[PDB]
Amino acid sequence: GIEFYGPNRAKWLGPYSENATPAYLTGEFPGDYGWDTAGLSADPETFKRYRELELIHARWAMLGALGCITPELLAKSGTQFGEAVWFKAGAQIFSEGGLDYLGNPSLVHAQNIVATLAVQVILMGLVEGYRVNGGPAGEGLDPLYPGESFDPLGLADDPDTFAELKVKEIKNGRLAMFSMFGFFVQAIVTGKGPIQNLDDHLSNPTVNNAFAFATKFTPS
Amino acid sequence: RRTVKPASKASTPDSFWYGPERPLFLGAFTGEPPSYLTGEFPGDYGWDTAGLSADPETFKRYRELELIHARWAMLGALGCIFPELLGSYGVPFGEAVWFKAGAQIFQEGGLDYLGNPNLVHAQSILAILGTQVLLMGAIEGYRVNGGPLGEGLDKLYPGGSFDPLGLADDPDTFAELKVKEIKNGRLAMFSMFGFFVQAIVTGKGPLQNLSDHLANPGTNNAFAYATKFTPQ
Amino acid sequence: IEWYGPDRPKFLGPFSEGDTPAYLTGEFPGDYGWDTAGLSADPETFKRYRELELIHARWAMLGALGCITPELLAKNGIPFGEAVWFKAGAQIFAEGGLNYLGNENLIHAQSIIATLAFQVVVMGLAEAYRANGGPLGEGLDPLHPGGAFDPLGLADDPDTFAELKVKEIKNGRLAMFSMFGFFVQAIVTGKGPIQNLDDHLANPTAVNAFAYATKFTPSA
Ligand code: CHL
Ligand code: CHL
Ligand code: CLA
Ligand code: CLA
Numbered sequence: 001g002i003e004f005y006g007p008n009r010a011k012w013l014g015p016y017s018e019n020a021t022p023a024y025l026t027g028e029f030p031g032d033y034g035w036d037t038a039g040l041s042a043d044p045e046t047f048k049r050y051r052e053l054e055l056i057h058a059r060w061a062m063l064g065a066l067g068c069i070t071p072e073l074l075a076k077s078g079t080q081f082g083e084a085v086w087f088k089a090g091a092q093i094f095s096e097g098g099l100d101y102l103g104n105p106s107l108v109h110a111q112n113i114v115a116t117l118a119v120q121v122i123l124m125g126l127v128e129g130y131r132v133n134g135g136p137a138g139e140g141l142d143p144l145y146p147g148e149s150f151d152p153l154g155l156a157d158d159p160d161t162f163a164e165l166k167v168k169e170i171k172n173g174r175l176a177m178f179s180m181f182g183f184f185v186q187a188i189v190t191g192k193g194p195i196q197n198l199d200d201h202l203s204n205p206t207v208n209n210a211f212a213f214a215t216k217f218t219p220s
Numbered sequence: 221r222r223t224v225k226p227a228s229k230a231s232t233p234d235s236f237w238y239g240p241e242r243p244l245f246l247g248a249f250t251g252e253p254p255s256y257l258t259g260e261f262p263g264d265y266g267w268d269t270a271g272l273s274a275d276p277e278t279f280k281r282y283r284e285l286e287l288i289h290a291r292w293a294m295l296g297a298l299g300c301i302f303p304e305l306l307g308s309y310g311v312p313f314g315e316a317v318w319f320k321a322g323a324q325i326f327q328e329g330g331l332d333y334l335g336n337p338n339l340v341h342a343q344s345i346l347a348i349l350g351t352q353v354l355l356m357g358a359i360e361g362y363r364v365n366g367g368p369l370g371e372g373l374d375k376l377y378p379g380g381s382f383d384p385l386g387l388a389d390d391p392d393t394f395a396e397l398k399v400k401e402i403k404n405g406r407l408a409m410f411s412m413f414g415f416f417v418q419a420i421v422t423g424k425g426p427l428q429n430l431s432d433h434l435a436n437p438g439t440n441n442a443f444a445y446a447t448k449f450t451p452q
Numbered sequence: 453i454e455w456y457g458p459d460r461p462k463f464l465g466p467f468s469e470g471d472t473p474a475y476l477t478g479e480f481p482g483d484y485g486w487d488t489a490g491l492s493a494d495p496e497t498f499k500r501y502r503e504l505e506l507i508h509a510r511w512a513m514l515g516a517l518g519c520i521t522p523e524l525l526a527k528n529g530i531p532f533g534e535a536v537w538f539k540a541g542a543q544i545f546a547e548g549g550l551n552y553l554g555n556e557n558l559i560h561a562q563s564i565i566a567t568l569a570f571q572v573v574v575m576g577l578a579e580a581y582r583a584n585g586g587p588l589g590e591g592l593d594p595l596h597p598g599g600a601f602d603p604l605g606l607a608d609d610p611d612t613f614a615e616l617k618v619k620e621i622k623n624g625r626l627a628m629f630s631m632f633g634f635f636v637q638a639i640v641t642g643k644g645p646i647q648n649l650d651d652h653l654a655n656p657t658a659v660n661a662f663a664y665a666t667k668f669t670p671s672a
């Protein structure tokens with residue numbers, strides 16, 4: 001009996017959410033569980049800007065979640081990675097052979113981080129400005145769901161499929177954002193990769209959990 | 221030499237930083253700015269991608285915060301650069317670098333202005349703090365609510381005794397100097413954020429950071445301190 | 453003294469006639485006219501922020517009392533394996549676990565995982581009931597429900613209600629300020645609040661915060 005829209009949509013506190021919802025959180029936008037306890041989206045325009053921020057953070061966090069897990073899964077699958085862990089995958093530029101992509105010394109073989117950053121900043125500024133106001137791939141489209149070249153497969157030509165895939169997108173993205181915050185905090189706390197953290201939690205679940213690192217940041 | 225004719229014919233041929241045809245923060249990639257950033261206020265490049273100032277009164281309070289932070293940050297940039305700059309010339313400060321100059325009050329001979337014992341010669345920390353909080357509260361409440369140097373003046377650009385040389389009598393020059401102020405101040409705020417960050421990661425003075433950079437720019441950049449905050 | 457209306461006490465005292473926003477009517481408790489950042493221009497964001505303020509206030513009052521009590525009782529003579537508040541959580545990893553008042557047969561908690569499970573389940577239950585009601589209260593105020601939360605009945609008169617509201621929010625702002633102080637000066641000092649007061653009373657001009665001022669300098 002699931003809706004994901006309208007007044008009787010799924011909400012953030014489940015059955016205890018009928019008086020927990022602001023009047024402006026109409027069941028119009030994907031992922032609207034009624035979670036605005038802080039009232040930060042009371043203005044529809046601030047609400048629109050926050051929805052854009054949420055969706056872009058969601059997509060970037062999904063790409064980043066896949067990019068953190070994949071090298072470690074492949075390194076535990078056997079391929080050579082000079083530094084497989086994600087929070088030192090950036091320090092491969094300062095090694096002797098530079099940042100090899102999949103361990104092959106003749107795939108990319110990057111030696112200078114400043115030129116890497118220059119080409120990244122150039123390309124990224126170009127594409128983010130095109131994302132803002134359009135360009136070669138869409139002069140006048142939606143700021144969030146442009147389509148028309150970002151749908152080479154054509155999944156969302158029906159409004160109902162469009163809506164349900166919107167909800168799926170934003171929810172996989174909230175999941176990935178939560179998991180990326182976890183990556184950050186537990187890399188700082190543990191100092192090991194996410195896959196190795198799961199391996200250690202499966203080794204000894206009652207022992208090697210986050211509480212084993214609880215007295216780590218005490219001033220003393 | 222010719223006499224320049226009045227602005228009845230020329231009300232706004234110089235309004236380059238205001239109005240709808242104003243520079244924006246992404247140039248031609250900005251599209252059109254939000255409906256509330258219409259180009260009446262200085263430094264309006266249409267940057268509200270978070271919508272935090274969608275309400276007009278919150279936008280006013282944020283303009284106040286931004287301009288006061290900008291002035292304080294300009295003073296702070298000049299005050300962190302000047303003592304170190306003159307300490308590279310032979311003026312014997314206790315600690316010319318800014319994030320160590322506060323502890324000069326714990327020296328043997330106290331905090332000497334320009335490293336001169338016959339100058340201020342402060343020996344206590346909490347007399348400094350008490351005097352400072354007294355006078356700063358007085359003048360910040362004055363900035364808030366009138367005072368000896370102006371009562372019914374503007375909140376951000378009061379003038380009067382704060383425009384002694386009269387550089388804001390011309391409204392065109394005033395509208396241009398406001399943009400100059402806010403831009404120099406945003407630059408100084410960015411540069412004070414840089415001061416903080418590249419003091420934390422480096423621990424040297426900013427002018428010494430520049431000396432190190434121009435010693436070998438390909439080596440002495442911020443990526444040389446990228447692995448310092450690694451977990452364990 | 454009024455605490456309400458246009459000529460209420462304000463946060464800059466005599467300096468405060470021209471700074472107050474037009475939306476900060478003297479209607480709500482603790483309204484000293486302090487919105488320099490304009491974060492509560494919208495009445496709905498203002499309501500959500502008032503709820504956040506009052507809940508943070510009550511939680512900070514309970515926490516202030518919970519950090520002061522065990523140390524007082526600790527020098528008062530009572531054994532406290534770890535009396536200091538910012539390591540009172542690490543008692544679970546001791547040999548005898550977390551014993552409440554030093555008695556081995558009061559609580560004797562050995563598992564932090566089950567403690568946290570307990571806590572999450574009924575904190576979620578209670579906070580959802582706080583949001584939208586439940587066994588104590590349906591349709592009451594989100595902030596001052598009363599009924600079952602006034603077994604003594606202090607606030608049946610509107611004037612007593614208003615003055616106790618102001619007293620509540622001000623003791624709560626005091627406790628929030630003191631809790632921020634607890635946090636920052638535990639990180640800076642590494643000792644308890646009561647021991648910090650003892651050291652400040654032992655030597656007020658030497659043992660103050662400025663003695664720990666050069667502690668966080670980078671020096672590299
Ligand atoms: C009726 C039971 C029920 C309860 C109690 C909750 C509770 C929650 N849901 Mg919800 N849900 C419930 C039913 C349902 N939810 C959902 C669907 C969702 C979604 C999609 C989401 C939620 C989210 C949330 C959270 C929002 C509030 C928050 O941020 O916590 C704030 C309070 C805490 C985080 C306290 C944590 C407890 C713990 C004691 C903290 C530990 C303390 C540390 C040791 C201190 C830190 C130390 C420092 C110094 C380093 C909250 C945990 C959101 C979420 O995941 O946010 C996290 C969210 O995105 N729910 C559905 C499907 C329709 C439900 C159906 O019944
Ligand atoms: C007329 C004199 C008068 C002055 C100057 C003030 C000033 C203040 N009152 Mg107010 N009051 C005054 C009269 C009255 N007040 C009140 C009732 C209240 C209340 C209930 C409250 C205030 C608060 C405040 C503060 C709000 C502004 C702020 O947040 O500071 C911002 C500026 C600072 C904090 C500067 C601090 C100075 C110091 C130099 C900082 C040290 C620098 C560090 C070394 C740098 C840090 C290093 C880093 C890197 C770690 C401010 C200190 C609020 C408060 O307590 O907030 C804190 C508050 O809740 N007042 C009453 C009763 C009606 C008054 C009657 O006359
Ligand atoms: C769904 C995402 C997700 C997943 C699968 C994991 C999984 C894991 N985390 Mg990570 N973590 C996450 C989110 C996640 N975390 C987030 C959002 C944060 C920030 C608060 C952290 C912060 C964090 C730290 C600091 C540490 C871990 C650690 C761990 C491992 C041990 C489990 C533990 O200590 O729990 C800790 C979990 C949290 C602190 C918060 C996550 C909240 C979960 C998803 C909801 C509760 C689900 C749970 C099964 C039901 C309640 C259990 C009950 C006892 C309360 C395990 C591999 C530890 C590790 O490396 O061990 C090897 C460790 O040191 N995590
Ligand atoms: C306009 C302000 C300004 C200026 C002039 C400088 C200047 C400098 N900084 Mg500082 N910095 C700034 C802002 C500024 N920074 C800000 C806002 C931050 C916080 C993000 C930092 C954080 C920072 C760190 C952590 C470090 C420096 C360092 C340096 C020095 C080496 C340059 C470097 O490593 O770049 C690093 C630059 C950044 C991290 C961000 C600033 C970006 C600039 C201002 C905009 C782009 C302009 C630039 C020329 C183009 C770069 C793109 C290029 C790849 C094509 C140099 C003296 C390093 C140093 O001391 O070396 C000896 C160092 O360790 N800075």
Ligand code: CLA
Nearest residue numbers: 346349350629633636637640641648649651652660661664
């Ligand atoms: C009302 C609440 C309260 C109380 C009673 C105390 C009391 C104390 N604090 Mg704590 N503190 C507080 C709030 C409070 N603090 C807050 C809000 C912060 C965060 C900014 C701190 C941060 C802090 C640190 C980092 C340290 C202390 C320390 C201390 C002790 C020495 C005093 C000192 O160095 O002052 C420092 C006070 C502050 C930094 C801010 C508090 C602002 C007060 C309440 C307002 C000014 C009142 C004052 C009497 C009048 C002005 C004095 C004039 C010289 C300017 C003393 C037991 C030191 C300690 O442990 O010594 C044993 C220490 O290292 N405190």
Ligand SMILES: CC1=C[C@H](O)CC(C)(C)[C@H]1/C=C/C(C)=C/C=C/C(C)=C/C=C/C=C(C)/C=C/C=C(C)/C=C/C1=C(C)C[C@H](O)CC1(C)C
Nearest residue numbers: 035036037038039057060061064067068086089177180181
């Ligand atoms: C809703 C609500 C409600 C109420 O009202 C209020 C409040 C509470 C406020 C709210 C909440 C909010 C929240 C919670 C938020 C969160 C966020 C996040 C987490 C994000 C992330 C986010 C995240 C993200 C982006 C991520 C990203 C990622 C990436 C890029 C990655 C990258 C990378 C990788 C691959 C790895 C390698 O080696 C390198 C690098 C380079 C590193």
Ligand SMILES: CC1=C[C@H](O)CC(C)(C)[C@H]1/C=C/C(C)=C/C=C/C(C)=C/C=C/C=C(C)/C=C/C=C(C)/C=C/C1=C(C)C[C@H](O)CC1(C)C
Nearest residue numbers: 267268269270271289292293296299300318321409412413
């Ligand atoms: C626009 C926008 C838009 C969208 O919508 C959203 C967003 C993005 C959010 C936004 C952004 C924002 C930003 C970026 C901000 C920033 C800020 C800063 C940086 C500040 C600084 C700021 C800064 C500042 C004040 C500074 C100041 C300074 C000072 C006082 C100084 C002092 C001093 C000195 C002299 C030195 C000595 O020896 C000591 C001391 C004592 C230390």
Ligand SMILES: CC1=C[C@H](O)CC(C)(C)[C@H]1/C=C/C(C)=C/C=C/C(C)=C/C=C/C=C(C)/C=C/C=C(C)/C=C/C1=C(C)C[C@H](O)CC1(C)C
Nearest residue numbers: 294295297298382383384385386407408411414426429430
């Ligand atoms: C009102 C009035 C009135 C009457 O009528 C007239 C008069 C008297 C004239 C007036 C007054 C005025 C004034 C006082 C002014 C001031 C200004 C300033 C201080 C600025 C700054 C300004 C400032 C600024 C821009 C700043 C900037 C900064 C920067 C770039 C930085 C860079 C850097 C860094 C980061 C670090 C590294 O490693 C190095 C370097 C490379 C060094």
Ligand SMILES: CC1=C[C@H](O)CC(C)(C)[C@H]1/C=C/C(C)=C/C=C/C(C)=C/C=C/C=C(C)/C=C/C=C(C)/C=C/C1=C(C)C[C@H](O)CC1(C)C
Nearest residue numbers: 486487488489490508511512515518519537540628631632
């Ligand atoms: C008004 C205004 C105005 C303008 O406009 C803007 C601005 C400036 C933004 C604003 C301001 C604001 C502020 C200042 C805020 C603050 C806050 C706080 C401080 C909080 C605390 C807060 C605090 C709190 C909650 C606290 C809590 C506590 C607790 C739970 C406790 C717990 C505990 C204890 C018992 C101890 C043991 O061992 C353990 C534990 C577990 C640890």
